[PDB]
Symmetry: D2
Subunit: 252 residues, 4 copies
């Protein structure tokens, strides 16, 4: 099942889509500059691109580290990104009250892994009618994603994306089970599956190996965060090379 | 470090405190019925007791499944429970705005395991000044608990209980690492550590007993559960072990 | 199911048995010294005691680490330990051909975790008729122990002990599942279950004590060490064990 | 570091080598039927190929299982394979005495995962000077493979292949950490790293094995290790397609 996000086709058998940007919206000029560079590189390589950032990072390293610009200023920044570059945007939501105002501006709204089973937030997100990215919790097995998917379907929304970010592996460590992608495809109606390589890690050699491994299984998209910015092009050339190959061959 | 909750002394070298009650509050009458049972068994065995309940099921089976009586109704029931039995109570909170009004009624407020890293909830809970129970996430190392403790401490609240609930073990399984209790005690300033045996699980009663005794053998401040006279039989054995452990020099 | 080892009763509802000693046998004099210390401490507390050592260690830290005195001298040393102290002994075997001669002297023969599924060894061990200690591999679930037990039964030996050593938990780390003991008792006919607390670590003595107490709280036939510190430790284990064993299994 | 095996160059930046065949040798006629199929498919695909088989199943299902053809007959069959086809072969060895006589014939000798820490077997395999395939235990982290490599180097053999087979993940389940390939490259002097996709999966279909094989080979590996109306050929066309692409990109 494919999902149209403006003029982009997202699907497990379509050219991969890059979800990328910055961790926290900190500033207007810096967000536009970072986005500009993603846009330049992705346009150069013909890779569909969705800009990603959080306006309210609810899980932070210290209690007083900057949470981000907040809802109202964040949505203004997202508006400017869309106007300037003509691209879709993605951001997370943490409270039901945020869902409507965020969905009015943003093309994809994201369900944070730690809130993945909060029924109130799931219903509130489903009822926006927006395309939704479901972050798979590290403590949740790939077969348990259909339970989240069914809660969205009950509440009236089937425009869902499932996002791998790794699995708990002993203490303080993550492993990405490459078979999980297929389990999610076969148990959740072949909805688009994307891979958050950044949060699946802990290094640029690791990210590349892990991204290539993932994309070899035939995925709708790759999800990353950047600070290295200038090595983006070399990275994407490799991802595109593998994706073009995999996608050019019929499924067996 | 000990924590006083009314006339109960909670701490890792004190007689263990039982935390128990129901999953989610449905009605006044069934709530008072469950609590009376717990008070009856715990009084005759001489075990300090704190009643536990959630006013909301945050993760429902269905979009249209029953959720619980909610905040305003839940709090009224907790006020009744306290009035009738004169015992402390504990409930979990899921949104920052809920923290202060829950804290007015409930002696201990609980940080759910999924929300343990929600910085706004941590602050709001800390602001209340109430005793806080921190549910250790199944995906978090015991040595990482010190980071959650630090945040409560920078938010001005040191009345913290650390609660074990097992660790992710492959897919859809949990294991309890008995060494984690010790790591938490050493790294988090000997705050009271309690063991949620109920959530650490998923002959099934025999399992809870083996697991509870193994946990309590490491010297814990309390035992946390949801649950012939099966509670009685269980607690008689736990108290015997706890009495022995706590009578040995550290 | 109980197992008689000379005058010792080993079982999940009998007073715990201590298994311990030295890593590898070097000399008669050196062995008698360590053994004598274990014997004196355990005798002082009335804890039954089985002395453990390897005569030929297959899984050494380095290629050229001393392997031990070897079969012939090793067995002479075990014979002396038995005569001097009147206690049973335990040793690992890793080749089928050594099982019979070792079983002439050693009361309990031990199957290394890494050879737990080597059918040849299992059969050679079974055929001795001796009590056998099966070390559970860290990658084997407690519900798989039944299969090892079945292979010993097929080979004519039911006198088996199951030895817990921990489970792989991510990379490097081991975790001991306290529920595994129960699963093994329930699925393997209540064969005696012992707890190798030392391997299970990785150690700190504080950690050893917590982990040992936790496991013994589940009601176990014995405690296995790969080791007045021993006295203080054994006093605590005995306290817990006497309490647990004194109470009826849940009604 | 590359390794020459007859006319095959094995290395993490060379075209992948297939290590392929069966579980155990049963008949000489049944073995040639399998090998001939592997050879014709790989030759037309231009994939270098090494024939794999065991001469003994050391972990029987029951005590009364089909162990296999045995050593004496096995070596004769491997002879016949190398004469007929002109390819290298690989097999596992489980006892130190077997190593030199097996290495006289079999180009690559394999350290079973369960015996990874058997020091006598490591030294015996090392001493043959043959290329050695090290099966990574499901319980060993990739950071710790360097310890086995260390022992082989110390015993004087550097022609080592590292074979990934998955990692213990909870009970009775395996996960393959795609990052471990890189860890092993970086910590073990860039020795050839191969991927046993078959064993990595036997706790979970061709669809599965393909996804997993493609993911692993995407990390740039020296080879693929497997077991088994034209499924191998179709499967290998897809692997070669990805390998060719990956190997043509600069590191
Ligand atoms: Cl031992
Ligand atoms: Na929208």
């Amino acid at each position: 099942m494919d999902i149209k996000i403006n003029d982009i086709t997202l699907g497990n058998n379509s050219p991969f889509v890059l979800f990328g940007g910055i961790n926290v919206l900190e500033s207007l000029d810096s967000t536009l500059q970072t986005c500009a560079h993603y846009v330049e590189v992705t346009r150069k390589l013909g890779i569909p691109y969705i800009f990603k950032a959080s306006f309210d990072k609810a899980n932070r390293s210290s209690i007083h580290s900057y949470r981000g610009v907040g809802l109202e200023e964040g949505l203004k920044i997202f508006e400017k990104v869309k106007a300037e570059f003509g691209i879709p945007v993605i951001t997370d939501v943490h409270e039901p009250h945020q869902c409507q105002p965020v969905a009015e501006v943003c093309d994809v709204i994201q369900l944070p892994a730690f809130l993945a089973r909060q029924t109130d937030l799931v219903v509130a997100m489903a009822k926006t009618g927006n395309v939704v990215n479901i972050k798979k919790p590290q403590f949740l097995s790939p077969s348990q994603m259909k339970n989240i998917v069914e809660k969205f379907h009950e509440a009236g929304n089937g425009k869902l994306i499932l996002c791998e970010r790794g699995s708990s592996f002993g203490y303080d460590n993550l492993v990405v089970d490459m078979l999980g992608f297929g389990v999610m495809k076969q148990t959740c109606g072949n909805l688009p599956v994307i891979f958050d390589v950044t949060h699946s890690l802990q290094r640029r050699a690791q990210a590349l190996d892990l991204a290539l491994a993932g994309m070899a299984t035939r995925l709708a998209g790759l999800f990353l965060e950047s600070h290295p910015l200038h090595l983006l092009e070399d990275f994407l050339i490799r991802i595109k090379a593998l994706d073009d190959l995999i996608k050019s061959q019929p499924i067996l």
